[PDB]
Symmetry: C4
Amino acid sequence: VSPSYNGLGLTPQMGWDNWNTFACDVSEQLLLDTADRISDLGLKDMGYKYIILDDCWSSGRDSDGFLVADEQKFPNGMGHVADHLHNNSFLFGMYSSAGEYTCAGYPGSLGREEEDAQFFANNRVDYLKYDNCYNKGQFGTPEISYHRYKAMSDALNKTGRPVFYSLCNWGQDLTFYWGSGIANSWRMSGDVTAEFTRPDSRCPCDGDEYDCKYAGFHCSIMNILNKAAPMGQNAGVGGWNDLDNLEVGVGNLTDDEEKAHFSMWAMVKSPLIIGANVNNLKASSYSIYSQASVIAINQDSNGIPATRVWRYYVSDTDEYGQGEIQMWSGPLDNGDQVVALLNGGSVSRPMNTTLEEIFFDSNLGSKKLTSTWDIYDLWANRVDNSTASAILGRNKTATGILYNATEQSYKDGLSKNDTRLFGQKIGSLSPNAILNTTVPAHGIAFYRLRPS
Amino acid sequence: VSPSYNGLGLTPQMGWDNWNTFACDVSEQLLLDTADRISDLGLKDMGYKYIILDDCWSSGRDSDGFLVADEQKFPNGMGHVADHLHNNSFLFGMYSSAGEYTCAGYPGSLGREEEDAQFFANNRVDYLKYDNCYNKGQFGTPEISYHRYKAMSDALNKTGRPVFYSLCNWGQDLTFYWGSGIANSWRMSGDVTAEFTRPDSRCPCDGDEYDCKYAGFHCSIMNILNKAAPMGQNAGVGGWNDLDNLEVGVGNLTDDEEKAHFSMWAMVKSPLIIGANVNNLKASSYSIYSQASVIAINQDSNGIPATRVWRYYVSDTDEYGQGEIQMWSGPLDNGDQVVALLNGGSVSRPMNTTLEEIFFDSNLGSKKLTSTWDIYDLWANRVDNSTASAILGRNKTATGILYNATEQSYKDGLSKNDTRLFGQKIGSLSPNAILNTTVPAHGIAFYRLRPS
Amino acid sequence: VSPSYNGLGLTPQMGWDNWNTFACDVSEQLLLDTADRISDLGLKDMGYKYIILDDCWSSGRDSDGFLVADEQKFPNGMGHVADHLHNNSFLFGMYSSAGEYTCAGYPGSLGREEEDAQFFANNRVDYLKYDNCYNKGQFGTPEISYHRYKAMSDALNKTGRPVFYSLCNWGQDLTFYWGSGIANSWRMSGDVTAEFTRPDSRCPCDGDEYDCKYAGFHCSIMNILNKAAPMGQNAGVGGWNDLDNLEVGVGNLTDDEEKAHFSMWAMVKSPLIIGANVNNLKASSYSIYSQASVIAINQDSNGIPATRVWRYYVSDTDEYGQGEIQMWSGPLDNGDQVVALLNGGSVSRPMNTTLEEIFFDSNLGSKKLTSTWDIYDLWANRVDNSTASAILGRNKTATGILYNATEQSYKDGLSKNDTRLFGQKIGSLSPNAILNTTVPAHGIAFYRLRPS
Amino acid sequence: VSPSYNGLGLTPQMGWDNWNTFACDVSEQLLLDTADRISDLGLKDMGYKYIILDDCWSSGRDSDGFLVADEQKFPNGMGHVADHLHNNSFLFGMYSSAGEYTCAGYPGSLGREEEDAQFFANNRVDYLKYDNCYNKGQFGTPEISYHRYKAMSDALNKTGRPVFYSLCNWGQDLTFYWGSGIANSWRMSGDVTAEFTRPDSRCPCDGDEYDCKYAGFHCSIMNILNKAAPMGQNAGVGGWNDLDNLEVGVGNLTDDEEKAHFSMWAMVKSPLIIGANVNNLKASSYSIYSQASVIAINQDSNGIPATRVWRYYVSDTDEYGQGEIQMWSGPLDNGDQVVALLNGGSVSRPMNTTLEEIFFDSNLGSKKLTSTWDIYDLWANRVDNSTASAILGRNKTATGILYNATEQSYKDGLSKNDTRLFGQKIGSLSPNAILNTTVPAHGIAFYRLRPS
Ligand SMILES: *[C@@H]1O[C@H](CO)[C@@H](O)[C@H](O[C@@H]2O[C@H](CO)[C@@H](O)[C@H](O)[C@H]2NC(C)=O)[C@H]1NC(C)=O
Ligand SMILES: OC[C@H]1O[C@H](OC[C@H]2O[C@@H](O)[C@H](O)[C@@H](O)[C@@H]2O)[C@H](O)[C@@H](O)[C@H]1O
Ligand SMILES: OC[C@H]1O[C@H](OC[C@H]2O[C@@H](O)[C@H](O)[C@@H](O)[C@@H]2O)[C@H](O)[C@@H](O)[C@H]1O
Ligand SMILES: OC[C@H]1O[C@H](OC[C@H]2O[C@@H](O)[C@H](O)[C@@H](O)[C@@H]2O)[C@H](O)[C@@H](O)[C@H]1O
Ligand SMILES: OC[C@H]1O[C@H](OC[C@H]2O[C@@H](O)[C@H](O)[C@@H](O)[C@@H]2O)[C@H](O)[C@@H](O)[C@H]1O
Ligand SMILES: *[C@@H]1O[C@H](CO)[C@@H](O)[C@H](O)[C@H]1NC(C)=O
Ligand SMILES: *[C@@H]1O[C@H](CO)[C@@H](O)[C@H](O)[C@H]1NC(C)=O
Ligand SMILES: *[C@@H]1O[C@H](CO)[C@@H](O)[C@H](O)[C@H]1NC(C)=O
Ligand SMILES: *[C@@H]1O[C@H](CO)[C@@H](O)[C@H](O)[C@H]1NC(C)=O
Ligand SMILES: *[C@@H]1O[C@H](CO)[C@@H](O)[C@H](O)[C@H]1NC(C)=O
Ligand SMILES: *[C@@H]1O[C@H](CO)[C@@H](O)[C@H](O)[C@H]1NC(C)=O
Ligand SMILES: *[C@@H]1O[C@H](CO)[C@@H](O)[C@H](O)[C@H]1NC(C)=O
Ligand SMILES: *[C@@H]1O[C@H](CO)[C@@H](O)[C@H](O)[C@H]1NC(C)=O
Ligand code: NA
Ligand code: NA
Ligand code: NA
Ligand code: NA
C-alpha cells in the first residue's frame, strides 16, 4: 500500500470516451450533446463524471510550439468545452501520446511535455489519457518507460492544476510495478474489442502472457481479464490497473457476455469508462451500465482487486476453440466478500464452491469458515428492458429509479445498508455446505456475501 | 498512422537486388546489363525501379577515411553507375552495415556514418540497404538499436539528397515499433531461402517467435510470413515491414509455392525486390513477377497490410512435418477487400469462408455483411508460359502486353476500373452463403472483392 | 567461492520475524515478550538469535529527514529495544524497503540510504531486511537492481557497525548472480505461504520459472523449493539464497509437510527464520523447529547447498493437481552426505535409490562407490508431542533436553561425534544394493550417510 | 566473415587445461611433467600446443596492486614456466576472471585489467582464459558484457605481446554476436561434464535454450552440442564458439560416446583442449585424441562449422529419458564435405541419408547432386588399443606413427592427398541412391565425401 501520488484515484475513475464509437469525427457539439445525454440518463450521478475526448482533436502547433485545437471541430477552443462540462458538474478528459505522434498521427507530446501540460492546464482539463504510439525507441525496459511517463507526470504537477493521470502504454515494461508513484491508472494490455474470447493475430500475447512484448490490439475480453489476473496485488487506492474501456453496448456481445465483462471489470477495480454510443445505446446495455450494486463493488473504499481462486479449461468450447471456467473472490471494506463464478464455456453449466474456497486465505477453524453467510445476488433488481427503453426514448425520467451517488456516496450508502447497493438476498452458506448455481454460457454468477 | 519521415515509401518499394544469385562477383557491366534486361522485360515500368547493389563492392578506405569502390569491379566509380541508371529512368541502391564490417567482411559504416552517407550522396545513390553484421555489442534493447540506426538516418538527411532508407537488422529489438520515424522499411526477420516451409537449424526461431533473439538465416517463406503476421499494425504509408527479397525464379519452388509467396508478400505490403537472376529467369517465374493485379494490391494508396483471420494445423504435412492452412483478409483504399485462402498442407484441399470472416471487423447487420460482393480472381489473365518464353528469348516485346505503371499509376488505373488490375470476375458472394474453392498444395486462392 | 563480503553469514542466519503472524500490530512489549519466550524455549541457544522487527514500525520522518519510530508502539525508541535484546544475548533485526515506501506504505529508504543506515547504527541494529516495494522504476536488469541494493550496502558499511544484510527483492533480475559481493543473503522468490503445493494466481511463475518477471506472493513451499533448485551453485559461505521465513506452526500444514518444508530449507542452506507465533506454537511444530540434527545440516561449516538429483511427476496428485517426487543429495564438511527422498505425491509410496545416485559426482570404482555407508535417520529422537507440550505450558524446562549450540557450536559437536546431531543409525548401504523406505504423502525421508 | 581481430585463431586452438582433473593442486612441476608427456606422446606436434594453467595459481596482490603467483606452487614465478614451455616449442596459457574473484575465490581482474594484462605480458603468457564469476552486476545485456570483456581485450593489446584471447562467460548475453571483434573464442555454455545426455538441475537450460539466463554447469555433452547448433553461422576464421574442454579420457564415457563427443567438437570448429589427465590416460581415449583425420576437419583452412541438417527424437531412450538422432553436414575448403550421422538413442540403429540432404544448400540438377562422391571413413586407421597402450607405457615411440602437423600443416597435408588425413575409402554415393550404415548407441558415423 502507498498513498495516492497526487490525491486522486481514491477509487477507480468512471466516465465515457468518445472513441470506441466515433473516431476522429468529433466536435464541441458531439461532445456536449453526449455529455447532456449522460447527465439526462442519470449515469453522471452514478459516478460517470469524466467525459474523455480522445485522439484527432488538434490541427498542429502554433508559432510558439503550442498545441492548437482544430478550429473547425472546436471553434471556441477546449477551455470553453471544459467550462460547459463543469457547469453541468462533469469532469473533462483530453488525450495525447508519449511519442512524436498520437496513434492517429496527430502531434504527440514527447519532448514537449511542459508546453503540452501547460496547454491542458490553460484549457482547464481535469484528466489526461496518455498514449504510447511513436515513442521513438524510448521503451524496452522498466526504467526507460517509467522516465518517459514520469516526464508528463512532473509537467502536469508543475502546472499546479489537479489532473487525473491515466497511462496508456499497454502494460509495456511491467507497468503494474512502477505506475502508482507517477500515475492514477495504467492500461495493462493492448486494446479491447467486442469479442468475449476470440484469439486475434493482432493480439499475439495469450491470456497467460501478462508480460508481453507486442501488446497489439483486438484482444478479447477474456484475454485481457486473463492478463490482469496476477496484477491485482499491484493495484490499490491511488493507482489502478486499467483493462480498457467497456464494450457494453458496442458490437454484438450477448447480455451474458456484457454482464460478465462489466462484473469482472468492476471486481478487479478497473476504471469503468463507457465505450458505447450513449445516443444509440440499447436497453439491455444501459441497465448493465446502471447496475448500482456492481458499481458499489468497483467503488469500494480502500479497494482491493479480487483474486482468481481457480481456473479450468472445459470441453464445451466455442467457435474459436475457447472454453474455460473461473472462480474469483475478494474482500470488501465492510467485511463482506465478492464472489464470481464465471462460465466462459459455450454451454450453460452447474457451478459450485465452498466457504474454504471463498475465504481462500482464512485458516481452518477461523470465524469466517466457522460462520454462516447470506448470499446476495448482485444482478437482482436490474432495470428491466421496458423501463430502460422508456428512459432511453425520453418517456420516463431516471430520477428516483437510478441510485444517485452524487447525493449519497457508495461508501455511505453501504453503511446505511442501502438495498439498492447489495442486490437481493437469495440464500445462506453454512460451514460444510456447497454453494450451487447454474451459470449461462459466457455468463456469470456474481454474489456479495454478508455475515448472517 | 504517421506521415512518412522523409517523404518516401508512400507505397512499398520495388526493384532488384544482385545478391540471391550473384554474391561478390559484381561489376558495372553485370549491373547495367541486368538493368537493361529489367527495362526490356517491362518490369521497370511495372514499378521495379530500384536496382540495388549489395555487399562486396568496396576495396577499403582511402587516405581521408572515405569508402573506395573496387576499381576492378567499378572502373568508373559508383556515380557513373548511378548516371547510367538514371538515364534509363532507374533508381540506384547501395549497401553497407551498421557495424565494423559488412556481412561478407568489407568496410562497415559504424562510427563512419557521416563520411559514408556523404560517399553515397557524392555518388548520387537513391537508396540504402543498411545491414546489422558486426555491430560491436550495440544491440540487445530497442533503445540501443534505434540510436545505431538513427545515426545513419540523420547522416543521410544531412547530405540533403533524398535516400530511401532500408533497415536490415532482422527485426532485432522489436524493429516494427521504432523503424518508421527514422526509416522507410525494415527487415523483420533472418534471411529468406527458397524453401516454402522447411525448418532450419540456422533459423532457430519458429513462426510464432516474432520477437527473436537469434534471427539467423535460411528461414522458410512460411516461417517469415508467420513472424510478420502480428506486425501489420505497425506498418503503413512511409514505413513498411520487409519480409526479404522474393525467391520467385530462385532454386526449385513450385509454381504454386511461388504464387503463394508472391501473393502473400504483396498482401502484407512488403517490398517486392526481385531475388531472381533475370537473365536466367524461367517463364513461370517471370509471369508471377509481372502479375499487375497482385502488384496493384501491394501498391494500394494509403496501404494497410492484411490481417491473418485464422490459422489451423492440418494432418496433410510435408516431408518436413509442416502443414497449416490460413485465411487472410484486408481492406483496400477504394472500398474493395483482398482475401487469401492459403493451403500450406501437402495435398490439394477444399477451402471455404463467409462474409462474416472476410469482414472480420464489421458488425452483424452492417452494410458490408448485408450486401453482395463480386469475387475477382487476382490470378486470372496471367501471362501464359508460351508468351513469357517468347518475351524472355527476345522474340516478342513486353510493350502493350504488360501493364505500364509509369504511364498509368496503380491508383489511377484502379480508379479507371482498368481490367488488367482487378483480375477476372468469377462469381459473387451473398449474405448467408459460403465461398468455396479447391486450393493446390502449398498454394493460394487470391481474390479481390468488389461491391455488386 | 568467495570470502564473505563483510565477515558475516559464515553459515545461514537463524531467528524469528514478527510478520507471518502479527502484521503492523507490533510493540516493544510484543517483541520483548516473544524474545523472552524464544530464550525460555531454548530456541535462542539452538541458533535462533536474530529477532527481526518487520514492516509498520515507523511514523514518518523528523525535521532533519531522519526515520522516526512510532512513539506509541516504541515509547523508548529502537535503541532501547536493541539493548534489552543484547542483554539477553539476542541479535536485533529491522526492516526497510529499497523504494519510496515500504510494502505496507511506511517511509522507504530509496535515496535516503545514508541517513537510514545511520538511523539503524544509532539504534544499535545488527541486521537489516531490505525490501523491494515502490522501487520507482529502478529494476528490470541486473545492473540497475544491483546498484540500488549496493547503495544501502555501502551506507551500512560506512556507519562502521556490523550489520547482517538481507536482500528482499524476490530474485528479481537474477539476484543469485550478484548478491554475494554486497550482501549476506537474498530472497530468491515471491512470498511463501502455508500451502505445500498449491498454485496461486498471485504467484504467476511456476517452479520452473527461476527467472521470473512477476515474483508475486502466496507461492507454495514446493513452488519456492523448485525455483531454488538450480541456484544452489551460487550460494556459499557469506551469501545465501533465502527461501523465505518458515511456515512451520503457521496455518494448517501437516506434520509431514512441516518436516519436508523444514528439512528442505535446511538442506539448501536457506536461513531458518521462524514465521510462527511462538506464544501460540503447537507441540509438533515446536519439535520440528528444535530438531538439532537437521539444523546441523543447515549450519555445516563451509556450507554447500544440496543438489536435486532427480525429479519425476506422479499420477498420485492432490486436490490442486500437483504431484511430484524428488531426490536431493549434497556433501557435508566432515565427509558425510545428506540425502533426501521427498514425496510430494498425495499418497504414501515406496522410494528408493543407490550409491551411484547419492554420489552423483563420483566416478565408477571410486572409494565412495566402492565403500559401505551407515544410514542415519535425521528425524529420530525428535522431541515427542508430550514433552513438547509440557515445555510449551511452562511445566518442564528445555535445559538438558535441547542441544545448546551457544555452549557447543554445531561444528565442534559434529567433531565430537555428538549423538544429538547425527540422528539414529538405521542401517547401512553397500555397493550394488538399493536403499528403500516408505515415505508419507507430502513427506520426506531425510538421512545422513557416514562411512562404515 | 571478418578478419581475425588480432591475427590469431585462424583455426580453432588446441591444447590442454589442468583443471578437469587436477583442481587447485597445481605446481611448476605438475605443469612441466605433463607438458613433457604431451610432447613425448606426439600430441604437441599434432597441434595441441597450448598448455593452459587454470584457476588457483595466485596468492593475492603485492604492495603495487600486482598479481602475485603462489610462491609454494611456483617458486620461480610464471615467466620461468613460460620459458621452459617455449623451449619445448609449447605455448603457455593462464587464467583470470572478469570479476572481483575467480570462480575458486582467487583475485579477479575486474577494474584491474591494465596491471593484470601487464602481469601476463611480463610473465611471457601467450593465451588467456577469461572467466565470468563475481562480475559485480556487470552482465544482463549484450552491451554491458561486451564492454567488460573489451576492457581486458584492449589491455592485452596495449601490452604489445600477442595473446590468444579466450572468453569464458558461458554464452551469457548472446556472446556469439559480439565475441569476434574483441576475442578469438568464446564459451557458449555452462561447464561440460562426462555425461553424454544427462539432464542436470545445475544446468537448467535445455539443448533448445541457446539463449540462457542461468548457464550453470554439469551440462551434458549433447546439451552443449544442442545449444551450439544454431551458432555455427557466427563462428569463423579468427573467432570460434567454444563448447568447453574435451571429456575424452575423463570419467566413464564409452568409446562410442567419446568418439561422438570428439567428432562433433571437431565438426563445429570448437577448440580441442584436452581435459584428460594425460599421465593417467587410457588407451582408447588416447587414440581418439590422436585421430589426425578428425583433427584435419577441425583445422580446415577457412573453417566453416557444419550445419545440423535434421534432428529427431527416438523411442530408444536411455536411463535418463534421452534419445535423439541427428545428421550434420558442412563444406570443407578443398571442396569435400563432412557428414555426421549421430545416434544419441540407447540402441544400435540403421541410419541413412541421400545427396540432397548432404548438399542441403545445392539446387536440384546442380553438379554436386548430379555427381558421384567417394565416402571416406574418418574413423579408420585409428591407433589400436595395443599400440596405444605400448606408447602410453613408454614401450614404443609416437614418431612415425602419429601425424606430425608441425612438420606438415593440416592444409598442406590435405593438398598432398595425405592418406593419414582422409580416412579410408569405404564406398561411393551416386545420385538417387541412399547412404546406409549401422551406428552404435550414443555413437557416430563420421565421413568425408570427395568427388569421384
Ligand atoms: C449488433 O447486431 C445487432 C443485431 O443483433 C444490430 O442490430 C446492431 O447494429 C445496430 O442495429 C440496431 C438495431 O436496433 C440499429 O438500430 C443500430 O443503429 C445499429 N447500430 C449501428 C452502429 O449500426 C449491432 N450492434 C451494434 C451497436 O453495432
Ligand atoms: O511487509 C513487507 C513485506 O514485503 C514482502 O511481501 C511483498 C508483497 O507485499 C505486497 O505489498 C504486494 O501486494 C505483493 O505483491 C508483494 O509481493 C516480502 O516478501 C516480505 O519479506 C516483507 O518485507
Ligand atoms: O487513437 C489512440 C488510441 O491508441 C491505442 O490503440 C493503439 C493502437 O493504435 C494503432 O495505431 C495501432 O495499429 C495498434 O497497434 C495500437 O495498439 C489505445 O489503446 C487507445 O486508448 C487510444 O489512445
Ligand atoms: O575454476 C574456474 C572455472 O569456472 C567455470 O566454471 C564456472 C562454475 O564455477 C562455480 O564457481 C559455480 O558453482 C558454477 O555455477 C559455475 O558455472 C568455467 O566454465 C571454467 O572454464 C573455469 O574457469
Ligand atoms: O551480404 C550481406 C547480407 O547480410 C544478411 O544476411 C545476414 C547473414 O550473413 C552471414 O554473415 C551470417 O552467417 C548469417 O548469420 C546472417 O544472417 C541480410 O539478410 C542481407 O540483406 C545482406 O545484407
Ligand atoms: C505536486 O506534487 C506534490 C507532491 O510532490 C503534491 O503535494 C501536489 O498536490 C502536486 N500538485 C498537483 C497539482 O498535482
Ligand atoms: C433484455 O434484452 C436482452 C438483449 O437485448 C436479452 O438478452 C434479455 O434476455 C432481455 N431481458 C429479459 C429479462 O428478457
Ligand atoms: C531532412 O529532415 C527534414 C525533416 O526533419 C525533412 O523535412 C527533409 O526532407 C529531410 N531531407 C532529406 C534529404 O531527407
Ligand atoms: C507453366 O510452368 C510451370 C512450371 O515452370 C508449371 O507448373 C505450370 O503448370 C505451367 N503453366 C501452365 C498453365 O501449364
Ligand atoms: C566495510 O568494508 C570493508 C571492506 O571493504 C570491510 O573490511 C569492513 O569490515 C566493512 N565494515 C563494516 C562495518 O561492514
Ligand atoms: C504429534 O502431533 C502431530 C500433529 O499435531 C501429529 O501429526 C503427529 O502424528 C504426532 N506425533 C506422534 C508420534 O503421534
Ligand atoms: C593491437 O591492435 C591492432 C589493431 O587495432 C593490431 O594491429 C595489433 O596487432 C594489436 N596488437 C596486439 C599485440 O594484439
Ligand atoms: C579399445 O578399448 C575400448 C574401451 O577402453 C573398447 O570400447 C574398444 O572396443 C576397444 N577397441 C577395440 C577395437 O577392441
Ligand atoms: Na458555449
Ligand atoms: Na559509361
Ligand atoms: Na526497558
Ligand atoms: Na627451471
